[PDB]
Design a protein around this ligand. Structure first.
Ligand SMILES: Cc1cc2nc3c(=O)[nH]c(=O)nc-3n(C[C@H](O)[C@H](O)[C@H](O)COP(=O)(O)OP(=O)(O)OC[C@H]3O[C@@H](n4cnc5c(N)ncnc54)[C@H](O)[C@@H]3O)c2cc1C
Ligand SMILES: Cc1cc2nc3c(=O)[nH]c(=O)nc-3n(C[C@H](O)[C@H](O)[C@H](O)COP(=O)(O)OP(=O)(O)OC[C@H]3O[C@@H](n4cnc5c(N)ncnc54)[C@H](O)[C@@H]3O)c2cc1C
Lengths: 473, 473
């Protein structure tokens, strides 16, 4: 549950046409868009929703917690449903994939109960998200026709939809599954590795890249996380390319660039691809296939918008259009699209790719660009870091050390990103840095920023101030 | 212990004049200023320091922790000393009050070892701080000539200097002291009320204002803290003006315009007033007597600076000159004065009066203006608040409710202040708001800010985002 009334953007209907709005996809992005449109303009527009899945408004972000038994069950993993959306005024078509769009006639055709259902629209909103990518691996193939990404080989898994996590959790039941291999060391793979380990399985995390969380944290923090997993029994196999998943009728072994591992299950957490084929080429696309949208989430075709993982978003850190597949962006782009499609001019403000991760008590957060990625992208970047206790040394209890990294542009002086890591939750602190980047705050201005002082909470010369003052480049 | 090398503001000596710089006062403001000057420009300048007290670089902020025995005595309540400052290159005179300044001959006269000592300067920096506020109360006077705020009536106490708390602790010895009255319900009085209660004494918190923490939090949260104190036996006597402290040779009773209370000790924690007598009418002063300074901390007399509690500061919440007596500000203004005094053009950026308080496990933070205060200043302000749990309902442990309030200008839409309260540490969250106020971010823009999402840390529709979206005015 997470509802409210009109947003502060909602404004008088005045003299705008009433619009019939078709929404394709109803997970994070679609649900946020639909709720915003109905709770704000309600009766003024006709909202029709289509989703090919048998369930919607699912919290995929909580699958690892469920698999790792960090939560009782799947109950709280849904933030809405067909009934709730309908109670807001929407017409919802479940298990009805939209299969074609006619932009001239302005209709979409979906398969409703095995029959072609044609639906007219004034505004069209794409919230189709993305699909898991299958790398070229011998023995890894998808059973054609499954909108659920089912592999032909038994115990070879993908983890994106609710069914996937349920399917995995089910199989984790039989004692036959003792060893699990997780392919891909991004945040999803890392979370999954912990989950299987927590379930008591022998885990091996494999990736062709030389470390985990690459592109999100700099070397010393990825090393720290890596050490964190190893000290919990997770075997790391970085710098290795998976060549094959073999076995007689089921997964029994995973073969890589330089090794072979006996495993009873393989999870592929390599990446996703935007679902933008319905564009039929009529819409401008980003290089990865994402619908290219402006700050109002509008595509190159007037009246048609795109939100969430199926579209781009403006990145204030890099200051260029980008593609950041996060539930956080899904919600905000959905809200922006909602208002614009309903006649309210609302321009988005871009994002910083802010994110957090928590594995075995090690908490980390980052926003913007790591030093590595900044340099890799042609920024004359530098990093200023500091490690110090959260509170004054005289505090007898509840203290802990924190490591902060602030990446800034040596030239323009603007802050490009920041990372924080500690054994206690200081995630709230990254919000300031997300805002800093958004607003173009420089490392010099940050250094003097009003950071309050209270002995029980922090030090007079807190690590943010110390790091900023210590900028040497 | 918060030392560091050069700041990011330091720059090549180029063709600048080094100079003789005299610093009057060496607590928070003076120490930070002295260190910035000696560490960044060391050799090029001659620094001489005068301080009328027998101890410098004290963390008065921890006296309540000290008194209430939450920490091991004054152990770590000092961030520097005479030896450290001299080793850095400064000449330090302890127990040497500066009794007059000759702005014409540009020289100061101090009492060193009971004899006048003149010192010439090219630059003068006032870090004389503040003194306790002492309204008209019969029986309450500071002994003539004491530079330690010693009351003439036995057991009547002020709490500002190291000796002041050692003195209170000394008095707390004899079991005869059973009841203590704390006059002033701001954060200091509230912290002291808890300290005396932890020491097992009966406490009565008296204030002319109808509530505690007036001007820091809105009635909503001050009620929370009031009930929090009462749940520990502290008696609240708000809406009462103390008229007299009486007794036969010592404190025995405190009288207000509404009641009379039988007490064995009285602590006056009404507030701070700028200590600017040395101005001699030659320097422009703020409405409260503070040295009126610009963004460079420079007074109306060129070459003369004022920092910390004896000077004003720019408030980005009210967008005007103000007086905010905080250690955080003392340190920042000292750094700015240091650089400018040494030839480096450094323009201050103002503050938001950010602050925090933690009593009996109730943690609160605020920055900028409260709705009441904003209105008291003529702002056509509004507030948008939200209360919800920090994390999703499915989180087994570590979850807790948080209440947030965001005050904004209905006209300009800029954020004027924010407050947060919870029984778990969410204090890092106020930093984003402090920055938002500094940058003049609007409520509309804040609602779309990129706030990351991780189930272990927060909710997709977190309370910051929800509060902003809920702006009604
Ligand atoms: C294991 C895991 C953990 C994650 N953790 C986090 C995290 O902690 N924090 C964070 O910010 N993000 C996280 N994410 C990313 C986040 O889940 C995605 O960014 C978000 O789900 C995208 O939402 P969406 O609505 O854009 O797309 P999707 O969730 O991909 O949904 C698209 C929807 O549209 C439907 N659809 C597609 N095509 C059609 C069609 N042709 N016709 C009808 N319907 C269609 C689909 O059935 C689906 O319901 C995580 C992802 C995974 C897999
Ligand atoms: C109980 C208490 C709790 C507090 N808690 C917090 C908190 O949690 N967070 C926060 O930000 N702030 C807090 N403060 C406020 C903070 O302590 C002040 O803002 C800060 O001390 C001001 O520093 P300063 O150097 O400007 O002045 P002061 O501390 O007043 O020092 C001025 C110095 O100059 C010397 N001096 C004065 N006149 C002369 C003279 N004529 N000749 C020679 N020397 C002279 C004095 O001896 C003194 O050492 C608290 C204050 C108190 C009393």
């Amino acid at each position: 549950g997470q509802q409210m009334g009109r947003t502060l953007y909602d404004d008088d209907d005045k003299d705008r046409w009433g619009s019939k709005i078709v929404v394709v996809g109803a997970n994070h992005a679609g649900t946020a868009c639909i709720k915003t449109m109905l709770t704000n303009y309600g009766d003024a527009n006709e909202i029709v929703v289509f989703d090919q899945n048998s369930n919607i408004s699912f919290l995929g972000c909580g699958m690892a917690l469920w698999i790792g038994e960090q939560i009782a069950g799947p109950e709280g993993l849904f933030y809405s449903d067909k009934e709730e959306l309908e109670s807001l005024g929407a017409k919802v078509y479940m298990e009805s994939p939209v299969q074609s769009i006619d932009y001239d006639a302005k209709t979409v055709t979906a398969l409703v109960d095995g029959k072609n259902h044609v639906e007219t629209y004034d505004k069209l909103i794409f919230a189709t998200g993305s699909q898991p990518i299958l790398p070229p691996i011998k023995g890894a193939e998808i059973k054609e026709g499954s909108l659920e990404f089912e592999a032909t080989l038994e115990n070879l898994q993908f983890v994106k939809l609710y069914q996937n996590s349920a399917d995995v959790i089910a199989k984790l039941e039989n004692k036959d599954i003792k060893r699990v291999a997780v392919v891909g060391a991004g945040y999803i793979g890392v979370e999954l590795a912990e989950a299987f380990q927590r379930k008591g399985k022998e885990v091996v995390l494999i990736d062709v890249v030389d470390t985990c969380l690459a592109g999100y944290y700099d070397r010393d923090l990825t090393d720290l996380m890596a050490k964190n997993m190893e000290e919990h029994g997770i075997q790391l196999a970085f710098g290795e390319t998976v060549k094959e998943v073999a076995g007689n009728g089921k997964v029994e072994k995973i073969i890589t660039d330089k090794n072979e591992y006996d495993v009873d299950m393989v999870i592929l957490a390599v990446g996703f691809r935007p679902n933008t084929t319905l564009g039929n080429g009529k819409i401008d696309l980003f290089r990865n296939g994402a619908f290219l949208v402006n700050k109002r989430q509008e595509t190159s075709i007037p009246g048609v918008y795109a939100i969430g993982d199926c579209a781009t978003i403006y990145d204030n850190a890099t200051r260029d259009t980008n593609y950041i597949a996060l539930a956080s962006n899904a919600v905000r782009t959905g809200i922006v699209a909602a208002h614009n499609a309903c006649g309210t001019d609302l321009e988005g403000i871009g994002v910083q790719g802010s994110n957090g991760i928590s594995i075995y008590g090690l908490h980390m957060v980052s926003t913007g660009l790591t030093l590595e990625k900044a340099k890799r992208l042609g920024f004359d970047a530098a990093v200023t870091e500091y490690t110090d206790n959260q509170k004054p040394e005289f505090i007898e209890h509840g203290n802990f050390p924190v490591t902060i990294k602030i990446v800034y542009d040596k030239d323009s002086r603007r802050i490009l990103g920041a990372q924080m890591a500690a054994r206690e939750d200081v995630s709230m602190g990254i919000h300031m840095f997300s805002l800093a980047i958004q607003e173009g705050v420089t490392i010099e201005k940050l250094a003097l920023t009003d950071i309050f002082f209270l002995p029980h909470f922090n030090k007079p010369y807190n690590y943010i101030t110390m790091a900023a003052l210590g900028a040497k480049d």
